[PDB]
Amino acid sequence: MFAIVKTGGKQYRVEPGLKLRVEKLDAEPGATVELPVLLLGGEKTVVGTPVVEGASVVAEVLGHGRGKKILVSKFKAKVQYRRKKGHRQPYTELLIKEIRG
Amino acid sequence: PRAKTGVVRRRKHKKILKLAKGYWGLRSKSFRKARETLFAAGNYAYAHRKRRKRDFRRLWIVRINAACRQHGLNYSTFIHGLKKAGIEVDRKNLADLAVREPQVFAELVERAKAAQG
Amino acid sequence: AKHPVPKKKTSKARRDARRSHHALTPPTLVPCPECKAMKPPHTVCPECGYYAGRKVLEV
Amino acid sequence: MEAKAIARYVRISPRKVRLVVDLIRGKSLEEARNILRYTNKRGAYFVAKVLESAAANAVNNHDMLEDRLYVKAAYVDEGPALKRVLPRARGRADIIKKRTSHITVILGEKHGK
Amino acid sequence: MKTYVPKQVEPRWVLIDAEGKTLGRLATKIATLLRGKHRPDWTPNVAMGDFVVVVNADKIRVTGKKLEQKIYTRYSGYPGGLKKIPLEKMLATHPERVLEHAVKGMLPKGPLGRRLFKRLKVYAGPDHPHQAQRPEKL
RNA sequence: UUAAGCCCAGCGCCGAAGCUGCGGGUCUGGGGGAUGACCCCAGGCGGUAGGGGAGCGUUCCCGAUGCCGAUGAAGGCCGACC
RNA sequence: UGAAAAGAACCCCGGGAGGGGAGUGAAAUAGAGCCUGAAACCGUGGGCUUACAAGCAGUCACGGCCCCAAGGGGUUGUGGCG
């Protein structure tokens, strides 16, 4: 099956079981379930119909073994006598586990 | 109490050096030729992360367009055909459908021209 | 110390680059009759010598 | 296995001998001998001697057997240079550097099938 | 996170000629063709696109008058002369180029656009003694 | 070259570090408030000369008749870890 | 230098110098202007990479090759920006 959900002002297409980062969510615990909106069924032998925001109730079932991740970066602005290496952004990641469509 | 320079500096430099490893010449052998570089490298990355974003914006349009052009229509027309139809979707990016599962796209195209009947 | 002068330290690159053609060339020696030693071509080496021509000492 | 030599503080610029040396890098001891024997340079007489001794060692010390050995590797390093003053016109005076070299040579056994 | 990459394709050529057209108005479309700008599996860094072949060269219309009005400076020897050439010349004295040039100044400047220009294959035909799969496009 | 030029109309895309979206940071304001400085809300956060506020390291003394220390100090050389 | 000369007998290469074994020592990359031994700088070996391409030398992006595997390192062929 196919599918396209939106999260964090961004929209991804998911399948029947997988995921990566998505951006911090109040899903406080790791072992928890949340369902994000959907945008295009998936065309498979189950459907293949989109529509206006596709707010047809149906959504994706997502669990998630996460923990606010981070990452290197180093943002060094620099003009001239002006240096500001004063920046480390790791950005909080939120790993999810897509379940069913 | 005389506070010698002692170690401090050496370290302060090794750091910047590591950062500039693999660079061209003294560019990666000079406690300062390195520095100067790491500077350009500074904005370069920063300025680019800003570019990359709008880099793919375009990088996609091409696909979309050079994809739905096969069904006799302008990316221009196409899009409009959606806005006035309804579709906070596709995400110039997610118009990856035009490639993977092109039938998914097809319906969209026909869906598109529809709004302009 | 005067007029024309280097305007920049030459890069370790272009430095070596300039030497590409410096490699030495192995001498050219050959079997040599009598002794299974070596001598360069067209040469009388002080060991066996030549024929009709002197050299070192032999018997 | 391998037999080393190394003759330090020779007194000849590195660049200068590196030349005769690269001329024997990896070769039959038997051949290099001839080579240096007829290579017109000064390095010869130096790398000669050394390479000749690596041989000795190889035998006398590591029972490697002459006939089977060659030039595993060899190279040369800068030694501490001797600075000297050179009277220059109009009393300028410069420091000439009588450079110095460290010739290392390591034999090795060729094969045995 | 996503991605969108194409594997090793298979150069699907094209034979073409609309000598009833205006070079340029044509050339573009040819260039557009050259680099895979139509084929929705884009990758400006790859080098995938049609192997375009143009036959029946010249015969090309060219709007208003270029009776020496269209000059080809293009050549600058080196000592004092920048040899100029009007259209008429190239047409008579071996044409083809006429279109060729029109294509170069449409293909990107890098070793790629350089490589892409290597694709284009124009002749003063008809007759393209060089094909095994001419997929004549309209 | 009935244009890829000029003038008069119409619709639509493109497009910036602008404005929205989602997340993180920080400083002021107002309240929560069983103060806990622990969370909401609303705004601000380009920057030379300057002004103001926080911090990080170096040597030394008190802590030391102490505590680490050959089961390895100091310094050095590496590392994609925290 | 080392706690201490125990400072390298003897054999081998070499005119010598230097070395290779041997031997002392906790340690000889502690062997004598010898603790530790940073950087510039000169080398040997290995990995990736270069002989149609125009550059403040980097940055962003894909792709390939080389050491551990829903990841990382190293390199860099095009492309974008400088």
From Swiss-Prot, chain A:
Transmembrane segments: none annotated. One of its GO terms (biological process) is translation. GO terms for cellular component: cytoplasm; ribonucleoprotein complex; ribosome. The keyword Cytoplasm does not apply. SUPFAM superfamilies: L21p-like. Keywords: Ribonucleoprotein, Ribosomal protein, RNA-binding, rRNA-binding. One of its GO terms (molecular function) is rRNA binding. HAMAP family: Ribosomal_bL21. This protein binds to 23S rRNA in the presence of protein L20. Found on the solvent side of the large subunit. Belongs to the bacterial ribosomal protein bL21 family. PANTHER family: 50S RIBOSOMAL PROTEIN L21, LARGE RIBOSOMAL SUBUNIT PROTEIN BL21M. Contacts protein L20. Part of the 50S ribosomal subunit. This is Large ribosomal subunit protein bL21. It comes from Thermus thermophilus (strain ATCC 27634 / DSM 579 / HB8). The gene is rplU.
From Swiss-Prot, chain C:
The keyword rRNA-binding does not apply. Residues 1-22 have a biased composition (Basic residues). Keywords: Ribonucleoprotein, Ribosomal protein. One of its GO terms (cellular component) is large ribosomal subunit. GO terms for molecular function: structural constituent of ribosome. Part of the 50S ribosomal subunit. This is Large ribosomal subunit protein bL32. It comes from Thermus thermophilus (strain ATCC 27634 / DSM 579 / HB8).
From Swiss-Prot, chain D:
This protein binds specifically to 23S rRNA; its binding is stimulated by other ribosomal proteins, e.g. L4, L17, and L20. It is important during the early stages of 50S assembly. It makes multiple contacts with different domains of the 23S rRNA in the assembled 50S subunit and ribosome. The globular domain of the protein is one of the proteins that surrounds the polypeptide exit tunnel on the outside of the subunit, while an extended beta-hairpin is found that penetrates into the center of the 70S ribosome. This extension seems to form part of the wall of the exit tunnel. The keyword Ribonucleoprotein applies. One of its GO terms (cellular component) is cytosolic large ribosomal subunit. GO terms for molecular function: rRNA binding; structural constituent of ribosome. Pfam families: Ribosomal_L22. InterPro entries: Ribosomal_uL22, Ribosomal_uL22_bac/chlpt-type, Ribosomal_uL22_bac/org-type, Ribosomal_uL22_CS, Ribosomal_uL22_sf. Keywords: Ribonucleoprotein, Ribosomal protein, RNA-binding, rRNA-binding. Belongs to the universal ribosomal protein uL22 family. This is Large ribosomal subunit protein uL22. One of its GO terms (biological process) is translation. It comes from the Bacteria. Part of the 50S ribosomal subunit. Transmembrane segments: none annotated.
From Swiss-Prot, chain E:
GO terms for molecular function: mRNA binding; structural constituent of ribosome. One of its GO terms (cellular component) is cytosolic large ribosomal subunit. One of its GO terms (biological process) is negative regulation of translation. Belongs to the universal ribosomal protein uL13 family. The keyword Ribosomal protein applies. Part of the 50S ribosomal subunit. Pfam families: Ribosomal_L13. Transmembrane segments: none annotated. Keywords: Ribonucleoprotein, Ribosomal protein. This protein is one of the early assembly proteins of the 50S ribosomal subunit, although it is not seen to bind rRNA by itself. It is important during the early stages of 50S assembly. This is Large ribosomal subunit protein uL13.
